Design a protein around this ligand. Structure first.
Ligand SMILES: [Mg+2]
Ligand SMILES: [Mg+2]
Ligand SMILES: [Mg+2]
Ligand SMILES: [Mg+2]
Ligand SMILES: [Mg+2]
Ligand SMILES: [Mg+2]
Ligand SMILES: [Mg+2]
Ligand SMILES: [Zn+2]
Lengths: 59, 138, 208
RNA sequence: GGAGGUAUG
RNA sequence: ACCGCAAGGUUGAAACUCAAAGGAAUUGACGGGGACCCGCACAAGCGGUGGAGCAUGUGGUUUAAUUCGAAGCAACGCGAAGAACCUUACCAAAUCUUGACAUCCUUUGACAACUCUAGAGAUAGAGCCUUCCGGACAAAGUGACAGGUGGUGCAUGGUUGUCGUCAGCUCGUGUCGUGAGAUGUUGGGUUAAGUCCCGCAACGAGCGCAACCCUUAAGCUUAGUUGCCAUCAUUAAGUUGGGCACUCUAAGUUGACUGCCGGUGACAAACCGGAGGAAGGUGGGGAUGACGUCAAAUCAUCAUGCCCCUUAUGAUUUGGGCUACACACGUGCUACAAUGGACAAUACAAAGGGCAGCGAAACCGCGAGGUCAAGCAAAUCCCAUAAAGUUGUUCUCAGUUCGGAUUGUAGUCUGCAACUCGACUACAUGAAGCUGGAAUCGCUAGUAAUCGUAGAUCAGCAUGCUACGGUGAAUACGUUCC
RNA sequence: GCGGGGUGGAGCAGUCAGGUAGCUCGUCGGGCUCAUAACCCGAAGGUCGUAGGUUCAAAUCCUGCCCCCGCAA
């Protein structure tokens, strides 16, 4: 029931506490970094492709 | 490594680093120094002298290696493992000499060993007993 | 044995972020912008042989730069098509965007272009084997120090999968100096989805 | 250096 | 039938049944076969788990549901870097059926916000007067259509784990062999390493090893604020006047390469030792994971072939459940105390976060915290007093002044609301537990061990995860065994 | 009708002579193991058929009853 809930979180909700983050391109709630509003997977995808500034795999 | 400040000896520091739990060198330091103070109180003479005599007593000269049934075959103990085992048994059998304070425990342990008594000497003679018993397998 | 993307390994060492902008705070909007641009170029990308786009941003302007080998199909003849792009694209973004078509000759030496080609071939139902063969052939005629190619999935309409790869030359992944251009694509074949990976290594240079 | 005898799936 | 005292010997079929039985050799795998080598594999050591309570995950049972997945090593504090509602996929009730969402035609239109009644809420119902800026917002009829956390991970892409950072896997040409195959890739010697040399029907090359990459360790060049304080005066306080010397910060550079000395060794590679030097023998630590094995995992990140539901397997709200509980397993926390507990004073860090967020000070509150309110988008200000340690005093071996579970009452913060089901505090109570059976785990150095701190997720919730520093060992005989 | 018996799930001691119910195998949980068996560590499981008396004390002695095995009938 993904894309429904995508619409649902992208809507406002009757009170602010119900508001939750999911990644904007993949409707995935968990492992979201709210700076990027990306999940861990898509973070890897894009930072490997070079599409996310700053980022460089470390040590 | 180095010798100790008050007494200038290698063994004392090597023993502190074996009494030491979780890197509390100063706690170990305190209790060993108070033990030397208390063994100067009781049996008045030098703490190093009585200590070195103690380890001369308990520090063994043989050992066994368990191989194959299972033989336990004797072997001549290395001179570093000598002091190693001496200090180890000293501390451990002190800890199970069972009284209030570890300084008292240690004081009594060095005392008994100086007089060739104590659990450490018992372990020594157990070791040599089983060694000579198994001497056939050398 | 579950090996990484070399561009992800090399970013910040010999090749630079395709996105070339700063924001202390607002990645939460600007990165999604970058991605939506990257997606909206489906228009061009469906035929225009676009390898990659770099993006830069300022206070006033966006400055984007799209690399290809058929640039006529994106600039029309005089500018009709770039203007067509500015209209809708700037309508989406709501910010003044200036673009820059840029040419990469030698189109059969570029990873994503090879991948696009072999994908469309395999959708036209050619043979994986001949495809990879002729790709590496033409690349080595263009004079690359190494090519590697791989296709994986239901080859020949087979009931189960395979992974077939070819190489000629040197592909030193663990060398970090090496600027090996990797590309992945897919092919929605009538039986399933063939996944193509391609690798070129066209000699050694540094960004500094 | 090589040859000959002398517990289950 | 013959012979034999006999045991039995000689002679010697068929019905039927199978599509193979078989021989020599090749590649691998295996071996309770052999030789060599290596690895915290043993061994020499240090500390733990299994014993108890608690947290958490899993199995099993139940329940309306206890959503779904992962299940030898390589599932089990794993997906989940956040289950009160939402999330939530499940269950009950109530509701909708071009639909919560997209593309199209047309009526249209700019839109509505924000009120009130009823409803548990979704919801309808009155309004409120919303205004063509032909694209745009907003609805409305429409059938095309959407939608599916529904099945197959044994149809798949992509992503990953593991054998294993082990050092191996292959190829071109040539040659041997009828051929599978072999050589190379084996041998001597060495190396952490198919690392190097030598030799040799092989010559070369590639993927791997290694170095390039990052960090840490010394120095040098530039620069000197928000960072530093030798020089001087000052002030509580490097704070402020002043200097950027020092530290530090961070860009460029130097540095370490068996580079040099001797000995050994096939003179070669290489080893052992030495000098110098901050550092010496891939300096230490990471990142990087070959061909491929396990039809390993994932169709619940996503994408997707085929199959299935489509007035329901789709969609909306409220409430429940994922938090159950006779039990078993795993991972960890707290302790079972004098190397200690309680109280008092006092000292030294690092790495990090911070905008509608970090919340100093002052004040109120015993304490959780509360009022006001400074500074702060950072080397300024806050988070943020680090704790262990040290100095004293006390308690003096007890189920204890140990431990802090459980329960009772009263409160604080968050939030739409803490019964199920948050954390926290104060008081009261004070359980089990005196260092754990058979078994078994981790670790070779600033490690183990122990003490604190920080951060992502996050309104709020961490004994978990990721990261930081402080104190700081024991031992390695050595390869006989697993 | 006569004579013997009934002790954890199976088979046997213990009854003669009253003094804290025992043996082997099994069952349950945990270990080892790739998993199972064996093996190692723990734990349950017995109003001694039952109901009455005697006894300080009952499997034990006495009474009564219900079954089991033979003989018979
Ligand atoms: Mg051991
Ligand atoms: Mg336990
Ligand atoms: Mg489950
Ligand atoms: Mg499965
Ligand atoms: Mg709900
Ligand atoms: Mg490497
Ligand atoms: Mg499978
Ligand atoms: Zn995502």
């Amino acid at each position: 029931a993904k894309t429904s809930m995508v619409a649902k979180q992208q809507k406002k909700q009757k009170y602010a506490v119900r508001e939750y983050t999911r990644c904007e391109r993949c409707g995935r709630p968990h492992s979201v970094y709210r700076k990027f509003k990306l999940c861990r997977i898509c973070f890897r995808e894009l930072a490997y492709k070079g599409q996310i500034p700053g980022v460089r795999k470390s040590w | 490594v180095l010798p100790d400040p008050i007494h200038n000896s290698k063994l004392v520091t090597k023993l502190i680093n074996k009494i030491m739990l979780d890197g509390k060198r100063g706690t170990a330091q305190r209790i060993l120094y108070s033990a030397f103070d208390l063994v100067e109180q009781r049996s008045g003479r030098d703490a190093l002298e009585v200590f070195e005599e103690a380890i001369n007593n308990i520090m063994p000269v043989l050992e066994v290696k368990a191989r194959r049934s299972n033989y336990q075959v004797p072997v001549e103990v290395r001179p570093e493992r000598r002091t190693t085992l001496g200090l180890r048994w000293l501390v451990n059998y002190a800890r199970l000499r069972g009284e209030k304070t570890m300084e008292d425990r240690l004081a009594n342990e060095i005392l008994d060993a100086a007089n060739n008594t104590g659990g450490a000497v018992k372990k020594r003679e157990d070791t040599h007993k089983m060694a000579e018993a198994n001497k056939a397998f050398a | 044995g579950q090996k990484i993307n070399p561009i992800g390994l090399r970013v910040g060492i010999i090749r630079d972020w395709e996105a070339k902008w700063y924001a202390e705070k607002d990645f939460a909007s600007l990165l999604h912008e970058d991605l939506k641009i990257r997606k909206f170029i489906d228009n061009e990308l469906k035929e225009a042989s676009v390898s990659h786009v770099e993006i830069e941003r300022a206070a006033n302007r966006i400055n984007i730069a799209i690399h290809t080998g058929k640039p006529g199909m994106v600039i029309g003849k005089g500018g009709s098509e770039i203007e067509k792009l500015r209209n809708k694209l700037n309508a989406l973004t709501d910010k003044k965007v200036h673009i820059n078509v840029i040419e990469i000759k030698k189109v059969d030496l570029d990873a994503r272009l090879v991948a696009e080609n072999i994908a469309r071939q395999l959708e036209n139902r050619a043979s994986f084997r001949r495809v990879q063969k002729q790709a590496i052939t033409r690349a080595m005629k263009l004079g690359a120090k190494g090519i590697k190619t791989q296709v994986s999935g239901r080859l020949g309409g087979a009931d189960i999968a395979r992974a077939e790869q070819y190489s000629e030359g040197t592909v030193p992944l663990h060398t970090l100096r090496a600027d090996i251009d990797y590309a992945h694509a897919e092919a929605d074949t009538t039986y399933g989805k063939l996944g193509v990976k391609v690798w070129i290594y066209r000699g050694e240079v540094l960004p500094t």
